[model samples]
Target: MQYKLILNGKTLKGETTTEAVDAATAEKVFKQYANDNGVXGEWTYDDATKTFTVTE
Candidate 1:
Protein backbone atom coordinates (compact mmCIF):
# COMPACT_ATOMS: atom_id res chain seq x y z
CA MET A 1 0.00 0.00 0.00
CA GLN A 2 1.02 3.62 -0.56
CA TYR A 3 1.04 6.25 2.18
CA LYS A 4 2.04 9.84 2.73
CA LEU A 5 3.19 11.38 6.02
CA ILE A 6 2.38 15.04 6.06
CA LEU A 7 4.21 17.23 8.56
CA ASN A 8 3.96 20.82 9.77
CA GLY A 9 0.86 21.53 7.75
CA LYS A 10 2.72 21.17 4.45
CA THR A 11 6.49 21.63 4.65
CA LEU A 12 8.27 18.38 5.46
CA LYS A 13 5.53 16.03 4.43
CA GLY A 14 6.36 13.13 2.16
CA GLU A 15 4.96 9.86 0.87
CA THR A 16 6.04 6.28 1.38
CA THR A 17 4.98 2.72 0.66
CA THR A 18 4.24 -0.05 3.17
CA GLU A 19 2.40 -3.29 3.73
CA ALA A 20 -0.71 -1.54 4.96
CA VAL A 21 -3.08 -4.43 5.63
CA ASP A 22 -5.76 -2.36 7.30
CA ALA A 23 -6.73 0.83 9.09
CA ALA A 24 -4.64 -0.12 12.14
CA THR A 25 -1.38 0.12 10.23
CA ALA A 26 -2.49 3.22 8.42
CA GLU A 27 -3.28 5.05 11.68
CA LYS A 28 0.02 3.97 13.16
CA VAL A 29 1.95 5.35 10.20
CA PHE A 30 0.12 8.65 10.45
CA LYS A 31 0.79 8.97 14.17
CA GLN A 32 4.45 8.22 13.59
CA TYR A 33 4.74 11.41 11.58
CA ALA A 34 2.77 13.46 14.11
CA ASN A 35 5.05 12.27 16.91
CA ASP A 36 8.31 12.84 15.08
CA ASN A 37 7.14 16.30 14.10
CA GLY A 38 5.74 17.06 17.59
CA VAL A 39 2.46 18.10 16.09
CA UNK A 40 -0.90 16.44 16.06
CA GLY A 41 -4.36 17.44 15.01
CA GLU A 42 -7.20 15.79 13.14
CA TRP A 43 -6.42 13.18 10.47
CA THR A 44 -8.33 11.26 7.85
CA TYR A 45 -7.79 8.05 5.88
CA ASP A 46 -8.67 7.31 2.31
CA ASP A 47 -9.26 3.59 2.08
CA ALA A 48 -9.41 3.64 -1.67
CA THR A 49 -5.79 4.79 -2.04
CA LYS A 50 -4.59 4.35 1.53
CA THR A 51 -3.96 8.10 1.87
CA PHE A 52 -3.53 9.76 5.28
CA THR A 53 -3.64 13.54 5.55
CA VAL A 54 -4.54 16.33 7.96
CA THR A 55 -7.60 18.50 7.86
CA GLU A 56 -7.37 22.23 7.33
Candidate 2:
Protein backbone atom coordinates (compact mmCIF):
# COMPACT_ATOMS: atom_id res chain seq x y z
CA MET A 1 0.00 0.00 0.00
CA GLN A 2 1.02 3.59 -0.56
CA TYR A 3 0.79 5.99 2.34
CA LYS A 4 0.73 9.74 2.00
CA LEU A 5 1.98 12.27 4.51
CA ILE A 6 0.44 15.68 4.57
CA LEU A 7 1.67 18.62 6.56
CA ASN A 8 -0.17 21.89 6.92
CA GLY A 9 -2.45 21.08 4.01
CA LYS A 10 0.27 20.04 1.63
CA THR A 11 1.56 16.66 0.54
CA LEU A 12 4.99 16.52 2.11
CA LYS A 13 6.07 12.98 1.38
CA GLY A 14 5.00 9.49 0.47
CA GLU A 15 5.72 6.02 1.84
CA THR A 16 5.23 3.38 -0.78
CA THR A 17 5.34 -0.10 0.65
CA THR A 18 3.51 -3.31 1.22
CA GLU A 19 4.20 -3.43 4.93
CA ALA A 20 1.75 -0.74 5.90
CA VAL A 21 -1.46 -2.69 5.54
CA ASP A 22 -3.72 -0.48 7.62
CA ALA A 23 -4.11 2.92 9.20
CA ALA A 24 -2.60 1.74 12.49
CA THR A 25 0.49 0.41 10.77
CA ALA A 26 0.84 3.49 8.61
CA GLU A 27 0.44 5.73 11.68
CA LYS A 28 3.61 4.31 13.15
CA VAL A 29 5.57 5.10 10.02
CA PHE A 30 4.12 8.61 9.92
CA LYS A 31 4.90 9.26 13.57
CA GLN A 32 8.47 8.16 13.21
CA TYR A 33 8.95 10.20 10.10
CA ALA A 34 7.61 13.27 11.86
CA ASN A 35 9.76 12.71 14.94
CA ASP A 36 12.91 11.98 13.00
CA ASN A 37 12.41 14.95 10.69
CA GLY A 38 11.54 17.33 13.58
CA VAL A 39 8.00 17.85 12.44
CA UNK A 40 5.66 18.26 15.37
CA GLY A 41 1.92 18.71 15.50
CA GLU A 42 -1.38 16.90 15.88
CA TRP A 43 -1.66 13.80 13.69
CA THR A 44 -4.71 12.30 12.04
CA TYR A 45 -4.90 9.23 9.88
CA ASP A 46 -7.59 8.50 7.37
CA ASP A 47 -8.16 4.79 7.01
CA ALA A 48 -10.02 4.94 3.74
CA THR A 49 -7.45 7.07 2.00
CA LYS A 50 -4.31 5.91 3.81
CA THR A 51 -3.28 9.49 4.36
CA PHE A 52 -1.61 10.95 7.41
CA THR A 53 -2.30 14.58 8.11
CA VAL A 54 -0.45 16.83 10.50
CA THR A 55 -1.51 20.26 11.70
CA GLU A 56 -0.21 22.93 14.01
Candidate 3:
Protein backbone atom coordinates (compact mmCIF):
# COMPACT_ATOMS: atom_id res chain seq x y z
CA MET A 1 0.00 0.00 0.00
CA GLN A 2 1.01 3.59 -0.55
CA TYR A 3 0.23 6.62 1.58
CA LYS A 4 0.17 10.35 0.91
CA LEU A 5 0.79 13.18 3.36
CA ILE A 6 -0.99 16.38 2.59
CA LEU A 7 -0.70 19.56 4.61
CA ASN A 8 -2.98 22.54 4.32
CA GLY A 9 -4.84 20.80 1.54
CA LYS A 10 -1.61 20.17 -0.36
CA THR A 11 1.19 17.69 -0.43
CA LEU A 12 3.92 18.13 2.17
CA LYS A 13 7.69 17.83 1.83
CA GLY A 14 10.11 15.06 2.82
CA GLU A 15 9.13 11.42 2.77
CA THR A 16 5.58 11.76 1.61
CA THR A 17 5.29 8.29 0.21
CA THR A 18 5.02 5.29 2.53
CA GLU A 19 4.39 1.68 1.66
CA ALA A 20 2.80 -0.81 4.01
CA VAL A 21 0.71 -3.91 4.08
CA ASP A 22 -2.10 -2.14 5.84
CA ALA A 23 -3.49 1.33 6.36
CA ALA A 24 -2.56 1.28 10.04
CA THR A 25 1.09 0.88 9.23
CA ALA A 26 0.88 3.64 6.66
CA GLU A 27 -0.85 5.90 9.17
CA LYS A 28 1.86 5.24 11.74
CA VAL A 29 4.48 6.25 9.23
CA PHE A 30 2.53 9.39 8.36
CA LYS A 31 2.29 10.50 11.98
CA GLN A 32 5.94 9.83 12.59
CA TYR A 33 6.91 11.64 9.42
CA ALA A 34 4.82 14.65 10.40
CA ASN A 35 6.38 14.78 13.87
CA ASP A 36 9.90 14.23 12.60
CA ASN A 37 9.55 16.76 9.83
CA GLY A 38 7.97 19.37 12.11
CA VAL A 39 4.58 19.21 10.50
CA UNK A 40 1.66 19.19 12.85
CA GLY A 41 -2.04 19.86 12.69
CA GLU A 42 -5.35 18.05 12.79
CA TRP A 43 -4.59 14.81 10.95
CA THR A 44 -7.02 12.39 9.43
CA TYR A 45 -6.25 9.09 7.75
CA ASP A 46 -8.36 7.50 5.09
CA ASP A 47 -8.07 3.76 5.06
CA ALA A 48 -10.01 3.44 1.86
CA THR A 49 -7.78 5.67 -0.26
CA LYS A 50 -4.57 5.56 1.79
CA THR A 51 -4.41 9.30 2.20
CA PHE A 52 -3.36 11.24 5.29
CA THR A 53 -4.30 14.86 5.42
CA VAL A 54 -3.63 17.59 7.96
CA THR A 55 -6.57 19.91 8.25
CA GLU A 56 -6.59 22.92 10.52
For each candidate, what TM-score against the reference? 0.57, 0.64, 0.67
Find the candidate with the highest lDDT and give its number.
Answer: 3
Please state every model's RMSD to the true fold in angstroms: 2.7, 3.6, 3.3
List clash counts for every candidate, in order. Answer: 0, 0, 0
Q: Which pairs clash in the backbone of model 2?
A: none
> Residue 44 CA error for candidate 1 (Å)?
1.5
Off by over 4 Å in 1: 7-12
Write candidate 3's Cα lDDT for 1-56 as tens digits.
Answer: 66776766345533367778777787778778677666667877765666788764
Lowest-scoring 10 consecutive residues by lDDT in candidate 1? 5-14
Between candidates 2 and 3, which one is better according to TM-score? 3
Candidate 2 lDDT trough over 10 residues, lowest sum: 9-18
* Order of the predicted models by lDDT, top scorer first: 3, 2, 1
lDDT by residue for model 1 (1-55), tens: 5566544364454555556666677678678756677656667766666667664
Runs with alpha carbons beyond 4 Å of true place in candidate 3 = 9-15
- Candidate 2 root-mean-square deviation in Å: 3.6
lDDT for model 2: 0.67
